[PDB]
Structure formats: C-alpha cells, structure tokens
C-alpha cells in the first residue's frame, strides 16, 4: 500500500529527513505513519527498489517548486493594498471540538460560560484550553473561584475518557451562534481620526469632554492624536522652534529612531555645523534601546503639543 511505501521511504531517507517531512505532514498522517512504522519487521531489496522507483517517478512530476503560500500571499497583499487590507484578507481566508471551539472565542464570554459549572470542570476545561486563553479567562473570575481553580489545577490527576467525551458533548450543546464572532471595525483610533477632522472649536469641546470623563483614555487619545512620524508634514519654522525647545541628546536619539526623511528634514532645519555635529555623534555612538528612543520621542511630542497650544506651532 501507499502507506507502507511511504513508511519504507521514511525509514530509508534517514531520521533527519523523515523528521523534516513529518514537519510538513498533518497530525493524522504522522500518527498513521508512526503506527505503521512501529509494526515494520522486514523490507526486502525488491520492495526497497520498487519504493525508490515509484518515489522518483512521482517526484519527476513534481518537482513542483514548492512556495511558502502563506508568506508569499501576505507579502503580495501587503505590497498591493497596504497592511490593513492585507491583514483583513488573510483573516477572511483563515476563517471542531467543543474545547477547541472555546479557544476560538472571546475571553469574557467563555469565562461566564464556564463560570456556571463545577470548579473541577472549570479547571479541567482551562487545562484543556490554550494557556493564553485560560489566563485571560482566569483574570476575569472572582478571587474565590480563581483561588479554587488554581488549587484544583495544582492537584489535577487526569480525567476518564467517558467523562471527557460527555464534557465535550455538553460544551458543544452549550454553544451558540458563534460564527463570525466579534469584528474589527474601529474605536479610539477612529475616534481620534474623527476628532482630527472636526473644527478647532470642536476639538476644544473635545479636550473639554474627554478630560471630563474617565481621564485615562483621554490621555491615551492625547498621545494617539498626532504621532512623531507626522512631524515631516509640519512647516519648517515649527521644526526650528522644536529644535530650539528640545535638548540635543533627545533630538539625536529621536532622529536615530525615526526615518531618514524626517532625520534629513530636522538636519535641514538645523544649522550646518550643528547638523554635522549631530551626524558625527550619531555615527560615533552605538545602538539605543527602543524604550529610550520612544521616551525621548514622547518628550519631544509633549514639547510639540506645548508649542502648538501656545500658537507657536501649527499642526
């Protein structure tokens, strides 16, 4: 049979080659081949030669020049329609057991679903669930239930297959219209974009109301509205004022972390000697951690906001 021929091929190609092939095979195929492999006792020379001949004849046809379909498709979609459309199309293309289905669900919904269950059952399901999903679910539980689950998981001794099957059937029965669960449309960022499109008086009202509410997401939107990479679109005088109001080291670090166009714009806005000194210091220095560069850019953006509010800078 073809399974026996594949088993002989895997035996005769070497452990490394067979292991590499199994990395390109599904779980069912790997399990079936391994089960067939363990029962192999003899492989005669005629059988070996026939297997080699058949495999070579099949490989003559393909010879398919295998391509990484996922990576190539992602790159094509990105370079064609941007990151957002590419990611949306990949999600559409990508889109089962009850436990596996729960792993494909929202944390709060699954948490409330299993919350109406015996704590041992909750612990068993969470063990059978993905670690990240289980951690998200447990963070939403009450302190007493969370402690009980953590205690039970620390003393988990395995479940009977019949109990596992019954639990899976119950979870399947409890399922709802989870098809196309959740949707990425917008929020916060879209609100910031809309605010940027509303009048100066309207954005004054916006500052007012956002400060009035929770305050935390208000500051988050303060940070979000306008970014450091948007400084390239500002007029030269505002950039020069920023150079005046920004320390040399912070500006140098920010330019190091920024794009060559923004760096060249800042250098042009600087004097010749100062720009040359900045370039020499950049060349003579070493790599800077991303966190430090981000902090310096945040400080520079705070200075930008301060100058813009006073009217010295136009955004």
């Amino acid at each position: 049979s073809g399974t026996d021929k594949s088993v002989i091929l895997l035996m005769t190609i070497g452990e490394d080659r067979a292991a590499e092939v199994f990395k390109h095979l599904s779980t069912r195929e790997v399990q079936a081949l391994s089960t067939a492999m363990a029962n192999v006792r003899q492989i005669s020379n005629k059988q070996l030669t026939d297997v080699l001949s058949e495999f070579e004849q099949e490989a003559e046809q393909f010879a398919a020049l295998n391509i990484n379909a996922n990576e190539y498709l992602r790159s094509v979609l990105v370079k064609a329609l941007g990151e957002e459309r590419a990611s949306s199309l990949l999600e559409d293309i990508l889109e089962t057991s009850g436990i596996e289905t729960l792993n494909f669900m929202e944390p709060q919904s699954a948490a409330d679903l299993i919350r109406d269950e015996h704590p041992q059952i909750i612990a068993t399901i969470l063990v059978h669930l993905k670690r990240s999903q289980a951690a998200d679910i447990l963070a939403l539980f009450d302190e007493r239930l969370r402690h009980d689950v953590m205690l039970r998981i620390a003393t988990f001794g395995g479940v009977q297959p019949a109990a596992l099957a019954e639990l899976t059937e119950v979870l399947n029965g409890l399922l709802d219209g989870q098809n196309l669960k959740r949707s990425k449309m917008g929020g916060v960022r879209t609100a910031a974009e809309i605010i940027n499109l509303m009048k100066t008086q309207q954005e004054e009202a916006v500052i007012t109301a956002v400060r009035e509410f929770d305050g935390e997401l208000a500051q988050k939107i303060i940070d979000e509205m306008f970014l450091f990479e948007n400084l390239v679109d500002v007029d030269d005088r505002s950039i020069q004022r920023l150079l005046q109001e920004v320390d040399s080291e912070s500006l140098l670090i920010a330019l190091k972390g920024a794009e060559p166009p923004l760096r060249e714009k800042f250098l042009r806005n600087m004097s010749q000697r100062a720009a040359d000194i900045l370039r020499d210091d950049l060349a003579n220095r070493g790599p800077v951690r991303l966190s430090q560069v981000e902090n310096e850019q945040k400080a520079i953006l705070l200075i930008v906001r301060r100058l813009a509010e006073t009217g010295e800078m136009v955004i």
Binding site: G2, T3, L9, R17, H24, E29, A32, A59, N66
Partner: peptide, 27 residues
C-alpha cells in the same frame, strides 16, 4: 543501492511530504 538513494535524500522535504500524502490518499 546506487546514487539514486543519495539523490532521493537530497530532495526537498515538502516534495517527499506531498508524495506521501498522495500515496496515502491513493490507499
């Protein structure tokens, strides 16, 4: 045991996986 074994060992693992899948389907 000629050089055919070495040539097969040098083939791409994806090709071997596809051949194995085809044989399993034909089973």
């Amino acid at each position: 045991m000629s050089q055919r074994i070495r040539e097969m060992s040098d083939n791409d693992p994806r090709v071997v996986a596809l051949v194995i899948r085809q044989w399993m389907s034909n089973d």
